[PDB]
From a paper:
Aminoacyl-tRNA synthetases catalyze aminoacylation of tRNAs with their cognate amino acids in two stages. Malaria parasite genomes encode two different lysyl-tRNA synthetases (KRSs) that play a role in translation in either the cytoplasm (PfKRS1) or in the apicoplast (PfKRS2), while Cryptosporidium parasites and humans encode one copy. We present a selective inhibitor of both Plasmodium and Cryptosporidium lysyl-tRNA synthetase capable of clearing parasites from mouse models of malaria and cryptosporidiosis infection.
There is a high level of sequence identity within the active-site region of PfKRS1 and CpKRS (96% identity) and an overall sequence identity of 47.7% and similarity of 64.6% across the entire protein. For both PfKRS and CpKRS enzymes, a marked shift (>2 °C) was observed when l-lysine was present, suggesting an analogous codependent binding mode.
Residue numbers in the entry:
A (entry chain B), B (entry chain A): 45 to 545
Write the structure that this text describes.
Amino acid sequence: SHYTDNRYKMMECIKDAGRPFYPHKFKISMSLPAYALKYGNVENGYIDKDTTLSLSGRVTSIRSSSSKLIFYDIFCEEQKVQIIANIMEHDISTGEFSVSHSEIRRGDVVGFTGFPGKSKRGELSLFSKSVVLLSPCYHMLPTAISGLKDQEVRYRQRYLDLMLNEESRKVFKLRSRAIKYIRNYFDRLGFLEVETPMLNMIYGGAAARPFITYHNELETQLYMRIAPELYLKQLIVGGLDKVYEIGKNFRNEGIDLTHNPEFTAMEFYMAYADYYDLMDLTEELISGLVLEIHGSLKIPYHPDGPEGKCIEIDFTTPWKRFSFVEEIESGLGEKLKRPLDSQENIDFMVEMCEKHEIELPHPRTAAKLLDKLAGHFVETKCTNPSFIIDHPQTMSPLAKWHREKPEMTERFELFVLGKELCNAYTELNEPLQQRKFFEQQADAKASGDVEACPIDETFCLALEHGLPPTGGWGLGIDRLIMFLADKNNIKEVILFPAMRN
Amino acid sequence: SHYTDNRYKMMECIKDAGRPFYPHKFKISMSLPAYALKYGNVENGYIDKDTTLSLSGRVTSIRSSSSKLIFYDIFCEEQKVQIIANIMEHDISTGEFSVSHSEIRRGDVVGFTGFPGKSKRGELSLFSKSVVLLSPCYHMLPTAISGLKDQEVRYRQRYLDLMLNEESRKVFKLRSRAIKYIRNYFDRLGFLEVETPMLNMIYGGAAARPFITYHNELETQLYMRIAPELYLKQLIVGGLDKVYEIGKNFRNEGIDLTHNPEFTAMEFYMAYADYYDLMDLTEELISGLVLEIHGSLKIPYHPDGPEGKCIEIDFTTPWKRFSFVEEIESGLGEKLKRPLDSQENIDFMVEMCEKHEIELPHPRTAAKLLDKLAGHFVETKCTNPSFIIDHPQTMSPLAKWHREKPEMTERFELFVLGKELCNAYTELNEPLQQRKFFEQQADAKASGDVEACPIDETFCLALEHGLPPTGGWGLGIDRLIMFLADKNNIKEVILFPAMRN
Ligand SMILES: N[C@@H](CCCC[NH3+])C(=O)O
Ligand SMILES: N[C@@H](CCCC[NH3+])C(=O)O
């Protein structure tokens, strides 16, 4: 803290002496990338004293070869430029040379004015006549993220990570590029991007515990959305035909290294599509995105970090399909009992979970037990992108009954390395069944399933106005970034992730 | 209503009789717009019996001239097509003609197969051979939104508005087009789009009361954001140079025709800009968007609805500037007392609010009093887009002190027709002052100012790492759409606005 208090003392001295104190505006002549572009191929030793330029960035290096010569590195917009400050060139009307430069520290934001060219040793340089302190750094910075107190500083103080660590800047640029690619894919198909409410008197459309809030003037409990699905289907009733939404969902659950209370999701709804159409689209969209980002469909992934084992993920299309129940039964060496939601089958699934050392869910609903079995026996087969298809109705209250398989729905999930990326189905559009599945959901919630949702009467009424046959789909954008950028925890792909206090 | 009950009984009859019941997949040959493009110019009476096509849409009309000849209109993706169903073309493998058509009602989503062409009277038609009920409508629909019970039905059941009313569909395509324009403008300048948290252990960056929630596992209270500003500025400390975010902010306040609990806002931050640069950018961005949508810079506005008076809004640049204090003082006929936040000026502004019958704020802070006076004397002058500039520091805790004007800041608001559209300033980047102004905001909060924010220690520490000279800017997208679309309430430009009950 001595360095910080000393810096406040310096700045007070600068202000009281009438020297530059946080200048409002510094007019650069060009960006540092442009400067490297215009001068990065001059002859060694070239200097143009007929051109005075102004540059600015953050100081990353200060070296004094002598009391008369000082070398700076400044960094801005991914470009480093060296500043050579020779006392012979200094503008005395800005102060004596030693005074001007004694106010500068590594980490400061500074401006320089001078002549362009390259040093005799060949370094792109500005031969400076002056230096302005634009915004001082009051703390001693490390030279790299290795010198941070610990690597959680990167998440709690993300500006330090971005300032010092090119890899972190790269991730969030890639994140923006990937989302651009996705919007363009759907815009070219004639989709309409929409926004639906994040605050509602009800929640639904996913299996998640919601955040609860309160509107004081309405005196009403509200929920933050867990998914936009039910609103988006109303827009298809309304005739908009192809809609998508990219935004935050909120889940009130565990904050570990791979779960964040808010996450970025996309959904789209396409009238007259079924889940087979959506499989084809998923493959085209995601393989095209991987090809765009990586230049091939085979990309590395390091589950235990960059010095650990590497798995090469192959996105070559088409992808493997695993049928939900059949693959469980192949793993068990026994068939599930029918109906899948009978007490007989619930008891059987409990027994199978205990036999295979699968953690039991609470409460022990057929749907939650089926999910545990799928997690053990099927998700574990999904190394390369793989579709798990035809989920039981009992775990898929909004998915339409399978046109051929009793008790199943026209649903798929996309898994990569055993992690869920997409969830999609032929949409249930028959209001009697929809109401019945909502009632079974509400019973699960009353029995202690914090992930079951209440009945939504406004959605049932919308279905009574005629939802066309429709296919809908969701994508977890954060998990997708994790694979594309090869990061093994979600805190790497979210600028300001939640952290335990 | 007997209609809904009867329709449910019809569908149960259909299901039990093995007749088509919510088909999973209907494969259209082409969209109705594509159909009109291909066949819209054939001769009257043309029919191509060598081509069989499948079309689908929602039934908007059923008419007939005998038991043998039925006429439908179907509507889909903004295009109407007439279907001519002659018993002599009926495919009996789908049932008897009279039975197949007895199942169809106005409002149903239906499919047809048949031959393309035009009736002798010149109507684009499909000469059908079959009809499929895809998703029935269980309610009797009006033919236009005028037949709705009330016009709050348009907002509470938006699918009915979208289904019946072309003007509502136009609004939301316009909204998408405008947001697309804004992204492209900033993408071309090299900006990076980012996402920052909507859930925080603190709130800040705007004047608004927040929604409060709770994270159960972390056992900690959270706030929904009122603005992303404090996170976005950390990204500039981090070196990202040019960032923007387009997302929801949340305000826990009154719900009415112009106030929604959530609204769509944009912010951007640009290193090395000042508020003068931001005024020029606002003019360029907004006038170019107006030009893109309207074809000129002079656009109509109907503050009392479409048959009422029409105002012309003139976006020709440069726009009028009003200086905050000077214009208040011109309206008063006398000067405010200095310092503006002295008890003397607080007493004086209370007296002025009383004399001019201005509703007093609570509490009676200098900032809220200054805001009441500016709303009365200055915002009312802002018909055409106009900048109110140089706000007092006492109401601008995050804006940098004005380089020429004591007590003022380098801030502007953009007003159109007396309503705020933008808020922007040269960013305060001096940490001592920033802490002082945060404490002042905390004191307002403790005195009952539900719109003042608590001190953010994480942000103060971020400024201690050096925020470059920076300009930041926010835009209320909903208000913008209201003007661009000539709508006089916010419920018209939000798909699912919050409503009473
Ligand atoms: N709402 C789903 C995504 C879309 C499912 C198909 N309608 C989810 O959160 O997983
Ligand atoms: N946070 C401001 C917009 C940005 C102002 C300039 N930093 C608002 O909500 O009005």
